[PDB]
Amino acid sequence: NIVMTQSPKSMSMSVGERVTLSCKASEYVGTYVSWYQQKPEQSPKLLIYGASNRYTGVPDRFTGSGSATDFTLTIGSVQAEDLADYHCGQSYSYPTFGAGTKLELK
Amino acid sequence: LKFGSYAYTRAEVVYEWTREPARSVVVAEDGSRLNQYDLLGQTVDSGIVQSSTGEYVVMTTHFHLKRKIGYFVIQTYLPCIMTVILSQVSFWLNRESVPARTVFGVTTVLTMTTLSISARNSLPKVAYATAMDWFIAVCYAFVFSALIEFATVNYFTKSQPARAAKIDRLSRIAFPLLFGIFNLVYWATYLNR
Amino acid sequence: YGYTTDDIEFYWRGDDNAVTGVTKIELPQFSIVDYKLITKKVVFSTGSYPRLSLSFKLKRNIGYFILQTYMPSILITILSWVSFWINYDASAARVALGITTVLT
Amino acid sequence: MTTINTHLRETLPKIPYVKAIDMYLMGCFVFVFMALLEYALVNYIFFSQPARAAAIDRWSRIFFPVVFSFFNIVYWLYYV
Amino acid sequence: GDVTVILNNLLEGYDNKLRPDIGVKPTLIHTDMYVNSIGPVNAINMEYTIDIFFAQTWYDRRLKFNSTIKVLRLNSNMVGKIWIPDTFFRNSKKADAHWITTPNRMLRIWNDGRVLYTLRLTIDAECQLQLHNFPMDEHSCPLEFSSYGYPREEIVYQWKRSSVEVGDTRSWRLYQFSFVGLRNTTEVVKTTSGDYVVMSVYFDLSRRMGYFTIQTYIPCTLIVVLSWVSFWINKDAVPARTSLGITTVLTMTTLSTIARKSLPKVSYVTAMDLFVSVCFIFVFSALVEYGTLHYFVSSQPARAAKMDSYARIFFPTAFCLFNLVYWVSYLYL
Ligand SMILES: *[C@@H]1O[C@H](CO)[C@@H](O[C@@H]2O[C@H](CO)[C@@H](O[C@@H]3O[C@H](CO[C@H]4O[C@H](CO[C@H]5O[C@H](CO)[C@@H](O)[C@H](O)[C@@H]5O[C@H]5O[C@H](CO)[C@@H](O)[C@H](O)[C@@H]5O)[C@@H](O)[C@H](O[C@H]5O[C@H](CO)[C@@H](O)[C@H](O)[C@@H]5O)[C@@H]4O)[C@@H](O)[C@H](O[C@H]4O[C@H](CO)[C@@H](O)[C@H](O)[C@@H]4O[C@H]4O[C@H](CO)[C@@H](O)[C@H](O)[C@@H]4O[C@H]4O[C@H](CO)[C@@H](O)[C@H](O)[C@@H]4O)[C@@H]3O)[C@H](O)[C@H]2NC(C)=O)[C@H](O)[C@H]1NC(C)=O
Ligand SMILES: *[C@@H]1O[C@H](CO)[C@@H](O[C@@H]2O[C@H](CO)[C@@H](O[C@@H]3O[C@H](CO)[C@@H](O)[C@H](O)[C@@H]3O)[C@H](O)[C@H]2NC(C)=O)[C@H](O)[C@H]1NC(C)=O
Ligand SMILES: *[C@@H]1O[C@H](CO)[C@@H](O[C@@H]2O[C@H](CO)[C@@H](O)[C@H](O)[C@H]2NC(C)=O)[C@H](O)[C@H]1NC(C)=O
Ligand SMILES: Cc1ccc(-c2nc3ccc(C)cn3c2CC(=O)N(C)C)cc1
Ligand SMILES: Cc1ccc(-c2nc3ccc(C)cn3c2CC(=O)N(C)C)cc1
């Protein structure tokens, strides 16, 4: 059972600048870490499949990276639409998701 | 174990694991023809190969092997330690038995050379120096230092016999303790790795 | 193989410059003294067939072997003579030297 | 002993564990090494009372064949 | 399908026995090469292994097609249907393509009839090593290739600026050699069947002296010093000195025999042989020194002691001097 520790648990960073979400895995999950976006009261939407691959119709500000256990998601410039909960999950083994981190503007 | 498609790029043929990647490469429990290695486990990954002809999907599998040391212990390290001790025992020998001590030293040094040359052939002809190479070198240095010590004793004897006795008695305990310290340091710095 | 001299005949195309590159050949241990091209017919119980033969004369380069084998031999049998210059009173040295030369 | 072991080693593959022929070879090398140590010991006490050195030599003269025979019996009974 | 129709039309009335523009002009073939790995360089057989991805591009007027599909990307199934150049490697002892899981061949055909044909090859190319200066020798030896049956009037090969590219070079099998660099070449060679455009790629390899250092240079030096240790031994114990000298000589001889075996049996002397022979001469000279001392002590011991002390103070200096001379001489040239 791979446990995906996702930090920080929340963010209130200002709009327009860089956002960095870092997801860490207890064991080796080669590149099967995915990033899902969950706007309030709505199903999650896939953003990053594998490590550092973007899904169809995703803003180009989103980009991920990570090799063995340290994976991160970067947003070039926040937008009003990016105010959502982000979850990192691994699919190297039976799926397990991270705690999910909330993004806030202020 | 990397594999993928020849002549079809990511835009045409893509590879994926049939089931969960962690469970997609299965090793038969009884199937292991390794003699000097232990298979700790396997790891899989999927990636891309950047080529002048295009971008190709490559599926990777890594088999983690840890070398077993029993054979190398028996064939190199225990013989080397035994040769070192065989050189050491000459100190307890009589000073007046100059031929005896000379025979011990020369035979031990020849024995260290033959072990060195026989141990180097087993592994490939790599340029760098391996851990076994350092162990062999240090054991060779110890035996050669024992030879130098005997030479110094024979040089002093009949001129300053008290000095010869002092140096021989000091060596009798300096050499074994230094060898033990080196052995502990080497085994700690390599095994705990 | 299957065709006798009533069906096939072999010859060297040029008969002198039919085999080329022998001069450019290099061997670690041999030197090609010369080569010859022969034409003939060999008879078997099944019939007579055309045979061509290409033969090389190879001479061994002695230089390697001298130092590799003879020199240790020449020395060992020279040192074996050192026992003569030592006084016969000292048995151990002379006996060891001779017998170890024999072992070598 | 070293050369016999080297000839044996060349034929066989690299295996971690210890074989019966390997056990016999360690036993025999131990015996040879112990004989050498015994000689060194008698030489050490040579300047001291030679009677003790002679007694040690006499003890060895009879014990070493006996101990080797017992070791052979044990080894050959274990593996058969 | 549309591609099925196109491929059926291309092969209809197609003679793969005849090269493109057979009676018109030489077929110009552009060749690239990706050096995946340069395998071991074993001098005993005087060869070296290399794994490459060979690519060849030429134009086939018969393969022109008009359709929205701009390139026909095909597997090895078509390789044997169209005409393929008969490129072969002239200095290959033995080479084979790869066949697992299927033939490692690719074929791409464009609208204008251009054909790209790549395949994976491992070649045991043979190149003569001049083992003078070994193990300080540097070598730069080729991988030549040409058309087997088509002279320059019918097939011409041509390189590209970025034709030859190399892999990472860290996973390569070169242990005693280092890859300095490569250069390419083209020329015409006269052959019994005509003149052929011969294309060459030279791989410059520099030897690593680190391994052979450990193997032979350190052991010989330390056996020489072992021989030295005889001089400080007392003059009285004749068996001691004789045993030391003979043991050094035997170890030196066996070390020389084994060390040479690492090298192909060549009739010329190598830099490695010279150092070994010098050390062997040094140990023999130590034996002769003790023998002369033994003969001269009976006549008078004072001269024997004087010359023994002189030898003790000299021999290390002589060995150091000869080491310096040898090393500088064989590093400069
Ligand atoms: C003295 O006797 C010797 C012994 O007989 C003799 O050697 C033999 O020579 C013949 C002819 O030269 C060789 O046959 C050729 O082999 C080529 C491949 O060579 C390599 O592989 C074979 C092994 O073959 C198996 O694996 C290959 C690899 O994929 C497959 O292609 C084969 O189908 C076969 O697979 C079977 O076997 C597997 C395991 O055994 C099974 O798991 C599998 O399920 C299959 O049952 C090796 O033997 C070769 O090794 C030898 O050669 C090398 C040479 O360097 C030596 O170094 C080495 O030491 C060995 O000696 C080698 O590794 C084939 O490509 C070739 O077939 C093509 O060409 C012929 C001629 O035109 C066609 O008839 C044929 O149909 C093939 O063309 C089709 O395929 C190509 C793709 O390759 C297409 O591009 C082409 O367009 C065409 O496609 C069309 O047809 C297809 C039907 O096939 C169809 O599907 C398509 O859709 C399309 O319509 C030929 O068979 C034979 O291997 C030699 N054997 C040995 C032991 O040497 C020697 O020459 C004699 N000497 C003299 C002087 O006479
Ligand atoms: C290597 O060995 C071969 C075979 O023994 C040698 O070939 C021999 O060459 C001689 C001279 O060319 C042949 O003699 C000829 O015999 C015919 C028979 O009619 C005669 O008419 C000629 O006047 C001549 O005397 C001999 O037959 C031939 N041997 C065989 C078996 O055919 C060869 O010379 C040797 N050396 C080299 C460098 O090849
Ligand atoms: C490989 O071959 C190509 C083509 O023959 C060489 O390309 C030349 O590179 C030089 C740069 O040194 C240019 O000045 C020439 O104009 C190039 N020629 C062409 C036709 O483009 C290349 O130098 C070769 N690489 C080697 C020898 O290492
Ligand atoms: C001149 C040339 C250059 C490259 C190729 C080539 N074609 C492919 C197809 C697939 C795969 C995985 C690797 N290929 C390579 C080699 C490569 O680029 N590697 C190893 C990084 C062929 C000919
Ligand atoms: C299975 C085996 C048995 C013996 C050896 C061996 N070879 C040597 C050569 C030289 C010297 C000094 C000691 N040697 C020993 C000693 C040894 O290993 N013992 C005592 C367990 C190696 C492997």
Domain that holds residue B132: 69-193
DSSP output for B21-50? GGGSS---SS----SSEEEEEEEEEEEEEE
How many Å lie between the centroid of ligand 4 and the Cα of residue B6?
A: 8
Q: Nearest CA of chain A to the CA of B24: how many Å?
A: 10
User: Which tokens belong to E290?
Assistant: 């003790």
Parallel, antiparallel or unpaired: strands E164-166 and E92-97:
unpaired
CA–CA gap between residue D33 and residue D39 (Å, rounded): 10
For residue E140 and ligand 3, the question of a CB distance below 6 A is answered with no
**Which residues of chain E are within 8 Å of residue B102 when distances are taken between CB atoms?**
233, 237, 240-241, 243-244
| Torsion angles phi and psi, residue C9, rounded to 5 | -140, 130
How many Å lie between the centroid of ligand 2 and the Cα of residue E193?
A: 30
- Choose among A71, A105, A102: nearest CA to A88: A71
CA–CA gap between residue D37 and residue D31 (Å, rounded): 10
CB under 8 Å to E161, separation ≥6 — which residues?
none
Domain that holds residue E46: 1-209
Residue with tokens 């033959």: B114
CATH assignment at residue A24: 2.60.40.10
CA–CA gap between residue B119 and residue B79 (Å, rounded): 11
Parallel, antiparallel or unpaired: strands C30-44 and B37-51:
unpaired
C-alpha triplet B102, B106, B108: angle, nearest 5°: 115
Gyration radius of chain D's alpha carbons: 17
The DSSP code for E63 is: G
Say if CB D25 and CB D4 are below 8 A apart. Answer: yes
Alpha helices by DSSP H, B44-130: 70-72, 78-88, 98-122
Domain shared by E242 and E160, yes or no:
no
Cβ neighbours, 10 Å, residue A96: 17
Say if CB B56 and CB B5 are below 8 A apart. Answer: yes
Say if CB E164 and CB E183 are below 8 A apart. Answer: no
Give residue E192's identity as a one-letter amino acid code: T
**Which residues of chain B are within 8 Å of residue A31 when distances are taken between CB atoms?**
45-47
B64 touches chain A (CB under 8 A): no
User: Which tokens belong to E184?
Assistant: 């390419």
CA–CA gap between residue B166 and residue E273 (Å, rounded): 44
Longest Cα separation, chain A: 38
Give residue D9's identity as a one-letter amino acid code: R
Angstrom CA distances, D18 to A84, B72, D15, D23, D25, stand at 64, 11, 8, 7, 11
**Terminal C-alpha separation, chain B:** 25
E207 touches chain B (CB under 8 A): no
For residue E187 and ligand 3, the question of a CB distance below 6 A is answered with no
CB under 8 Å to C96, separation ≥6 — which residues?
E239, E242, E243, E246
Residue C49 in marked binding region? no
Domain shared by E43 and E105, yes or no:
yes
CA–CA gap between residue A47 and residue A36 (Å, rounded): 5
How many Å lie between the centroid of ligand 5 and the Cα of residue B80?
A: 8
Domain shared by E26 and E36, yes or no:
yes
Nearest Cβ partner for B128 among E32, E210, E222: E210
Breaks (C-N over 2.5 A) in chain B follow: none
CB under 8 Å to D34, separation ≥6 — which residues?
D64
CB contact under 8 A, B125 and E176: yes
Residue C70 in marked binding region? no
CB contact burial D21-44 (16+ within 10 A = b; e otherwise): ebeebeebbeeeeeeeebebbbbe
- Residue in C15, C35, C38 to alter for ligand 2 test, most ligand atoms within 8 A of Cβ: C38
Which residues are paired to C34 by β-bridges?
C57
CA–CA gap between residue B180 and residue B183 (Å, rounded): 5
Domain shared by E61 and E157, yes or no:
yes
Angstrom CA distances, E140 to A55, D7, E34, E48, stand at 49, 40, 18, 12
For residue E202 and ligand 3, the question of a CB distance below 6 A is answered with no
Say if CB A47 and CB A35 are below 8 A apart. Answer: yes
Q: Testing the interface with C: which of E267, E268, E294 to mutate, by most C Cβ within 10 A? A: E267
- Specify the length of chain B in residues: 193
Q: Is E43 helix (H, G, I), strand (E, B) or coil?
A: coil
How many separate domains does chain E show? 2
CA–CA gap between residue C93 and residue E242 (Å, rounded): 6
Alpha helices by DSSP H, chain E: 2-11, 210-212, 218-228, 238-261, 271-299, 301-332
**Which residues of chain E are within 8 Å of residue B55 when distances are taken between CB atoms?**
none
- Choose among E187, E191, E121: nearest CA to E150: E191
- Choose among B41, B33, B31, B30: nearest CA to B64: B41
CA–CA gap between residue E117 and residue E102 (Å, rounded): 16
Query: Nearest residue of C to residue E46 by CA position?
Result: C28
Domain shared by E191 and E231, yes or no:
no
Domain that holds residue A44: 4-103
Domain shared by E289 and E148, yes or no:
no
Say if CB B53 and CB B4 are below 8 A apart. Answer: no
Domain shared by E127 and E234, yes or no:
no
Say if CB E28 and CB E58 are below 8 A apart. Answer: yes
- Mark which of E177, E209, E241 sits at the end of a domain: E209
User: Which tokens belong to C13?
Assistant: 């195309």
Angstrom CA distances, E126 to C28, D71, E35, E94, E142, stand at 14, 57, 17, 9, 8
Residue with tokens 């066989």: D12
Nearest Cβ partner for B35 among D13, D33, D37: D13
CA–CA gap between residue E114 and residue E135 (Å, rounded): 48
CA–CA gap between residue C24 and residue C35 (Å, rounded): 13
| Torsion angles phi and psi, residue E130, rounded to 5 | -80, 95
Ligand 1 atom 53, closest CA: E96
CA–CA gap between residue A19 and residue E229 (Å, rounded): 72
Whether cis (ω within 30° of 0) applies to the bond prior to E135 is: yes
Q: Is E54 helix (H, G, I), strand (E, B) or coil?
A: strand
Domain shared by E155 and E53, yes or no:
yes
The DSSP code for E68 is: S
Residue with tokens 């190598």: E270
Q: Is E267 helix (H, G, I), strand (E, B) or coil?
A: coil
Cβ neighbours, 10 Å, residue C77: 11
Count the alpha carbons within 13 Å of B30 in the hemisphere toward its beta carbon: 0
Say if CB B84 and CB B143 are below 8 A apart. Answer: yes
Gyration radius of chain C's alpha carbons: 28
CA–CA gap between residue D54 and residue D60 (Å, rounded): 10
Give domain limits for chain D: 1-80
| Torsion angles phi and psi, residue D64, rounded to 5 | -60, -50
- Choose among B17, B18, B13, B27: nearest CA to B59: B17
**Which residues of chain B are within 8 Å of residue D6 when distances are taken between CB atoms?**
118
Domain shared by E96 and E240, yes or no:
no
- Residue in E87, E93, E96, E106 to alter for ligand 1 test, most ligand atoms within 8 A of Cβ: E96
**Which residues of chain D are within 8 Å of residue B81 when distances are taken between CB atoms?**
none
CA–CA gap between residue B18 and residue A29 (Å, rounded): 17
B86 touches chain D (CB under 8 A): yes
Among the bound ligands, name the one nearest to the CA of residue E11: 1
Query: Nearest residue of B to residue A31 by CA position?
Result: B45
For residue E159 and ligand 4, the question of a CB distance below 6 A is answered with no
Nearest Cβ partner for A30 among B20, B23, B44: B44
User: Which tokens belong to B193?
Assistant: 């790795």
Chain centre to alpha carbon of residue D15: 24
Residue with tokens 């058309």: E147
B35 touches chain D (CB under 8 A): yes
Say if CB E201 and CB E180 are below 8 A apart. Answer: no
| Helix or strand holding residue E15 (H, E) | none
Parallel, antiparallel or unpaired: strands A10-11 and A101-103:
parallel
CA–CA gap between residue D63 and residue E272 (Å, rounded): 52
B114 touches chain D (CB under 8 A): yes
**Which residues of chain B are within 8 Å of residue D9 when distances are taken between CB atoms?**
75
Give residue E210's identity as a one-letter amino acid code: G
CB contact burial E203-216 (16+ within 10 A = b; e otherwise): bebbbbbebbebbb
Say if CB E122 and CB E49 are below 8 A apart. Answer: yes
Residue with tokens 């169209």: E82
Breaks (C-N over 2.5 A) in chain E follow: none
Q: Nearest CA of chain B to the CA of E190: how many Å?
A: 35
| Helix or strand holding residue C103 (H, E) | helix C91-103
User: Which tokens belong to E67?
Assistant: 């359709």
Nearest Cβ partner for A93 among B20, B46, B47: B20
Method: cryo-EM
Q: Is A30 helix (H, G, I), strand (E, B) or coil?
A: coil
CA–CA gap between residue B115 and residue B109 (Å, rounded): 10
- Choose among A3, A26, A31, A1: nearest CA to A98: A3
Say if CB E152 and CB E188 are below 8 A apart. Answer: yes
